[PDB]
Amino acid sequence: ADRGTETVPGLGQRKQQILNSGGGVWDLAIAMLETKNLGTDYVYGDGKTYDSANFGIFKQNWFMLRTSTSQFKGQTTNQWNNGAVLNSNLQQDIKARQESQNYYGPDKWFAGHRNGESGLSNPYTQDITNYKDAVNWIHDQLASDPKYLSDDTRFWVDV
Numbered sequence: 813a814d815r816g817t818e819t820v821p822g823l824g825q826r827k828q829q830i831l832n833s834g835g836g837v838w839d840l841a842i843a844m845l846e847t848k849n850l851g852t853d854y855v856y857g858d859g860k861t862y863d864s865a866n867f868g869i870f871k872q873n874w875f876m877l878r879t880s881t882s883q884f885k886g887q888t889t890n891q892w893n894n895g896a897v898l899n900s901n902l903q904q905d906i907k908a909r910q911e912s913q914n915y916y917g918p919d920k921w922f923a924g925h926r927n928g929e930s931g932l933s934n935p936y937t938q939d940i941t942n943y944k945d946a947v948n949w950i951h952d953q954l955a956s957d958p959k960y961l962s963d964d965t966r967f968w969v970d971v
């Protein structure tokens with residue numbers, strides 16, 4: 813099976829931090845696909861650098877951060893280490909992602925989040941659509957019972 817459930821100690825505390833730090837159920841769904849622990853403690857930049865570098869609980873990339881958020885408006889590729897603040901500031905992390913999606917719109921945001929600058933030029937590939945559909949499924953699972961907003965259940969999808 814390409815999707816399912818698992819129980820992760822501490823997840824509910826993370827879900828409630830997200831929902832109490834400006835996040836909605838939609839942000840939770842994206843974050844839940846990004847990491848198992850709703851955390852930022854994957855390797856720095858997810859092992860990537862400059863525009864590809866991933867930061868925050870959604871693993872937003874620096875290209876998206878510098879082009880579409882008020883926190884990083886107008887910054888350069890070389891300034892990519894400036895995104896690291898999102899690894900410790902959840903409020904700004906969520907606000908950045910929400911702003912990013914409002915700048916690009918959901919379609920474009922999905923493409924540029926999933927595939928960087930290249931995704932903006934081809935936003936409806938099968939891979940981006942699959943990622944979109946997985947996030948939608950996870951959101952549907954979380955929305956199906958309020959207990960999933962505070963328990964330790966993770967809904968995962970293999971994209």
Ligand SMILES: OC[C@H]1O[C@@H](O[C@H]2[C@H](O)[C@H](O)[C@H](O[C@H]3[C@H](O)[C@H](O)[C@H](O[C@H]4[C@H](O)[C@H](O)[C@H](O[C@H]5[C@H](O)[C@H](O)[C@H](O[C@H]6[C@H](O)[C@H](O)[C@H](O)O[C@@H]6CO)O[C@@H]5CO)O[C@@H]4CO)O[C@@H]3CO)O[C@@H]2CO)[C@@H](O)[C@@H](O)[C@@H]1O
Pocket residue numbers: 818845846847848858860863864865866870871872873874875925926927928929930931968969970971
């Ligand atoms: O413009 C700059 C250049 O950008 C390039 O594009 C980049 C882009 O900049 C950015 O770096 C982007 O980064 C992606 C990244 O590639 C990746 O997709 C990432 O998404 C992850 C996350 O890292 C984890 O890998 C996560 O893993 C979860 C699994 O999906 C799954 O849910 C799993 O569940 C399992 C379960 O736990 C249990 O074990 C069960 O038994 O089995 C299940 C199945 O495994 O749990 C995992 C979590 O632990 O998946 C997500 C999603 O895939 O997110 C970012 C996107 O934000 O990459 C692109 C490059 O592709 C280019 O455009 C370049 O041209 C530019 O110059």
